[PDB]
Write an enzyme that holds these catalytic residues in place. Structure first.
Site, PDB file in Angstrom:
ATOM      1  CG  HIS A 176      -2.110   0.744   0.791  1.00 26.23           C
ATOM      2  ND1 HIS A 176      -1.792   1.885   0.908  1.00 26.23           N
ATOM      3  CD2 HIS A 176      -3.776   0.438   1.196  1.00 26.23           C
ATOM      4  CE1 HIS A 176      -3.349   2.636   0.400  1.00 26.23           C
ATOM      5  NE2 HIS A 176      -4.779   1.347   0.758  1.00 26.23           N
ATOM      6  CD  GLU A 282      -3.338   0.444  -3.161  1.00 27.26           C
ATOM      7  OE1 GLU A 282      -2.811  -0.967  -3.237  1.00 27.26           O
ATOM      8  OE2 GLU A 282      -4.115   1.463  -2.670  1.00 27.26           O
TER       9      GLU A 282
HETATM   10  O1  LIG Z   1     -13.274   0.381   3.387  1.00 24.68           O
HETATM   11  C1  LIG Z   1     -13.510   1.721   3.355  1.00 24.68           C
HETATM   12  C2  LIG Z   1     -11.858   2.344   3.028  1.00 24.68           C
HETATM   13  O2  LIG Z   1     -11.893   2.718   0.863  1.00 24.68           O
HETATM   14  C3  LIG Z   1     -11.352   3.518   0.411  1.00 24.68           C
HETATM   15  O3  LIG Z   1     -10.542   3.635   0.223  1.00 24.68           O
HETATM   16  C4  LIG Z   1      -9.836   2.517  -0.144  1.00 24.68           C
HETATM   17  C5  LIG Z   1      -9.695   1.775  -1.289  1.00 24.68           C
HETATM   18  O4  LIG Z   1     -10.852   1.340  -1.652  1.00 24.68           O
HETATM   19  C6  LIG Z   1      -8.530   0.388  -1.246  1.00 24.68           C
HETATM   20  O5  LIG Z   1      -8.687   0.285  -2.804  1.00 24.68           O
HETATM   21  C7  LIG Z   1      -6.967   0.522  -0.942  1.00 24.68           C
HETATM   22  O6  LIG Z   1      -5.880   0.668  -2.028  1.00 24.68           O
HETATM   23  O7  LIG Z   1      -7.399   2.064   0.674  1.00 24.68           O
HETATM   24  C8  LIG Z   1      -8.370   2.714   0.451  1.00 24.68           C
HETATM   25  C9  LIG Z   1      -8.473   1.878   2.163  1.00 24.68           C
HETATM   26  O8  LIG Z   1      -6.846   2.523   2.843  1.00 24.68           O
HETATM   27  C10 LIG Z   1     -11.997   4.922   0.666  1.00 24.68           C
HETATM   28  O9  LIG Z   1     -11.556   5.557   0.423  1.00 24.68           O
HETATM   29  C11 LIG Z   1     -11.645   5.290   2.559  1.00 24.68           C
HETATM   30  O10 LIG Z   1     -12.251   6.465   3.041  1.00 24.68           O
HETATM   31  C12 LIG Z   1     -12.395   4.103   3.171  1.00 24.68           C
HETATM   32  O11 LIG Z   1     -11.509   3.942   4.820  1.00 24.68           O
END
Ligand SMILES: OC[C@H]1O[C@H](O[C@H]2[C@H](O)[C@@H](O)[C@@H](O)O[C@@H]2CO)[C@H](O)[C@@H](O)[C@@H]1O
Length: 322
Positions: A176, A282
């Site tokens: 990440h 990522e």
């Molecule tokens: O759990 C909800 C979470 O998701 C979003 O951000 C994520 C993203 O969706 C993923 O693809 C990942 O790569 O990283 C993020 C989580 O660290 C929302 O933008 C976020 O507010 C929310 O917490």
């Protein structure tokens, strides 16, 4: 010339290591997160660092280099593999998914360090068979070892995944990695031509689509007023060429070239609302919810370790000044 130095990072033990070009700090207790990466010539920090220990624990996937084993979402935290059904904790409630795997909030052990002319090496490891709550979800004897090497202008970052148990298991890994990215003065490029269509739970429908602005993405574009949370398919499988994301900082003229090997088939690109001053490119060896897709493994990137096998998935971050 290179050094290793034990330190305290926000009240937690950590290892600073480096040469005359780059310095890293890895924090074994914090999911072996590489929390800091500094370009020594210009003295610029490259990674987003937490203000306090507390804020880090609030969002441990949004600073430094968090390890996602397995990466991203598994719908309902459920899947089957070879006849067998698995239930992972549903930690993403509104979307009823398991999200980000087992390792980014556990303590890893430092297994060795090594220093020569060829660079400085730090190795960390975690054995999932020693994590009882993880075993309740995933009853297999997976062991993950990270090998960090700083050599010249590059941090190499290798994950070796081992099956030390009696049954086979599917696995994938992703990072990440969260870079400082000021929207006004930075550019981004990525080796991708297509991306996965996502539903409202951020799960793939199974369909691919062309990236309309792909020429821009290839050469380097700004991300002002673009909100990204997108699962891109690396162009490598189909066209060959490179497999990498590039961040260019316009003021200091620093290029950050984040390469990954052929196992890294997908890149999630995430910048929240685009106003937070960071960017997460990522790389993942498997697509979101890979365990649940009836698609060829050459496309999903799903991989399997038989008892006694191991695989090493490689990636690297190179700093160039121009
Ligand atoms: O759990 C909800 C979470 O998701 C979003 O951000 C994520 C993203 O969706 C993923 O693809 C990942 O790569 O990283 C993020 C989580 O660290 C929302 O933008 C976020 O507010 C929310 O917490």
């Amino acid at each position: 010339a290179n050094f290793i130095e034990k330190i305290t990072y926000l009240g937690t033990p950590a290892i600073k290591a480096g040469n005359e070009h780059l310095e890293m700090i890895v924090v074994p207790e914090w999911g072996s997160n590489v929390i800091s990466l500094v370009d020594k010539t210009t003295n610029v920090q490259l990674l987003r660092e937490p203000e306090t220990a507390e804020s880090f624990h609030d969002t441990p996937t949004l600073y430094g280099i968090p390890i996602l084993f397995p990466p991203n979402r598994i719908s309902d935290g459920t899947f089957s593999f070879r006849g067998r059904t698995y239930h992972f904790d549903i930690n993403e409630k509104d979307k009823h998914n398991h999200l980000h795997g087992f390792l980014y909030h556990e303590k890893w052990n430092v297994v060795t360090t090594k220093q020569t002319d060829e660079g400085v090496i730090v190795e960390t490891e975690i054995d999932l068979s020693e994590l009882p709550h993880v075993q309740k979800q995933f009853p297999h004897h997976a062991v993950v070892r990270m090998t960090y090497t700083i050599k010249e202008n590059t941090l190499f970052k290798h994950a070796t995944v081992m099956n030390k148990g009696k049954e086979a298991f599917p696995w994938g890994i992703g990072y990440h990695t969260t870079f400082i990215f000021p929207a006004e003065s930075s550019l981004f490029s990525l080796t991708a031509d297509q991306q996965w269509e996502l539903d409202e739970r951020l799960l793939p429908t199974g369909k691919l689509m062309d990236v309309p602005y792909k020429e821009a993405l290839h050469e380097g574009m700004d991300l002002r007023h673009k909100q990204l949370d997108d699962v891109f398919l690396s162009s490598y499988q189909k066209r060959g060429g490179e497999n990498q994301a590039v961040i260019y900082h316009q003021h200091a003229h620093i290029s950050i070239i984040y390469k990954a090997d052929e196992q890294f088939k997908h890149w999630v690109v995430y910048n929240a609302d685009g106003k937070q001053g960071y960017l997460c490119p990522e790389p993942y060896t498997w697509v979101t919810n890979a365990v649940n897709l009836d698609l060829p493994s050459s496309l999903t990137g799903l991989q399997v370790l038989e008892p006694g096998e191991e695989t090493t998935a490689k990636s690297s971050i190179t700093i160039e000044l121009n």
